[PDB]
Design a binder for this molecule. Sequence first.
Ligand SMILES: OC[C@H]1O[C@@H](O)[C@H](O)[C@@H](O)[C@@H]1O
Ligand SMILES: OC[C@H]1O[C@@H](O)[C@H](O)[C@@H](O)[C@@H]1O
Length: 428
Amino acid sequence: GLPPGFLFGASTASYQIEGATTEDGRGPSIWDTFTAEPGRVVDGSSGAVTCDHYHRWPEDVALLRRLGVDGYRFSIAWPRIQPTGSGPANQAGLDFYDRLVDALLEAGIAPMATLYHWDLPQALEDGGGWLDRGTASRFAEYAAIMGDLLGDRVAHWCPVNEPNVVTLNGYGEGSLAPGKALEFGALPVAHHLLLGHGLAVQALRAAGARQVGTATNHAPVLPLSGSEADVTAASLFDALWNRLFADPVLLGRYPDGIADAMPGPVAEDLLTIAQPLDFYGLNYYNPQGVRPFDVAAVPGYPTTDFGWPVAPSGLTDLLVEMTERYPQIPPILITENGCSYGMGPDADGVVDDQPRIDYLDSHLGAVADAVARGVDVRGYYCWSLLDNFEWADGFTQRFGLVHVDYDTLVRTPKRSFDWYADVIRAHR
Ligand SMILES: OC[C@H]1O[C@@H](O)[C@H](O)[C@@H](O)[C@@H]1O
Ligand SMILES: OC[C@H]1O[C@@H](O)[C@H](O)[C@@H](O)[C@@H]1O
């Protein structure tokens, strides 16, 4: 029971699929640095080659065409555009995205471009990365470059993927690149990511961009007990994970207490952060359990191969709660949803990933349930088109509609691919 003209897509990210890390003048990213360190990645892998989308993207565009998605969400590698994060653009970098976007348009696919999906140029990290306010300005300049090249052709833009992850995991506890562990010392990263968001929105509009939104991770936060310790920790986590990133964008304020902990002209910055958006993009996987706080899986649910709860009702609950908190929220696109399940091709070359079908089916139903309660949701993008490099978990977690063998680089559409193509057809 989805809206007429609901958009169906699929999503990837540059470092996770492209490979070709040293080709055509690409500069090192923080993820090149992180993956070169012993013990950072569970299986000792990197994004050196991964799916090798940089050389195999025609095949991938054709898979998207066969799938029949309305939209394809991809990320631009900043280090291919500006190897050091500043200075004149690398032509070969520009050429790659330019050609990709023209091919997507020939195939009748609406391109959704993410500017920042975590691959900061190392040269910018060397100067302090997102702890430096100046990084938000470098990001704004990069936005203008990509706006100038692609502005008239990209259907949708997402400046920053999951600023909450970049902040807490990258700089707060150091579980992801760049591996800093500042705890609350990471709050300035949040402010500069959000400032970067707002400046990029301006840059893209001035370049003639079409629709500009977000791609922020959101989850209902469930207290694991009744203890105040636990309800207060869950409230705190909700304030840090959800509100810290949505309140500034959608209301032009920080949650109570936070503005006074942020550097710079915060009031003026919040005007820059709160640029009007065409859509609000969110990434949803599952509710988060919480007990200054500790995050654990909510009990009682079946789990994916990543140990994550399968809890589609949490998506309905979230979409309803977001609409309550932010009545003026623009149309919502689900910019990512998906699941890790490890099955690969059997003796006959079939990948029977029925658990992935079940997950995606139930989540689409959860979107329909929120729509039925008056939530304005306009599309859904499956993470991912391809099995890919899952950050610190390497190649051990497969999220694809399409199986990728990392030795032969063969793509095999899974059962879920065929299922999704049928859903999309039925809905038209
Ligand atoms: O169940 C908790 C898990 O849920 C997920 O969706 C998050 O991405 C993980 O960071 C978290 O550990
Ligand atoms: O963890 C699974 C997926 O979660 C998302 O939040 C990220 O944007 C993806 O890059 C990642 O592969």
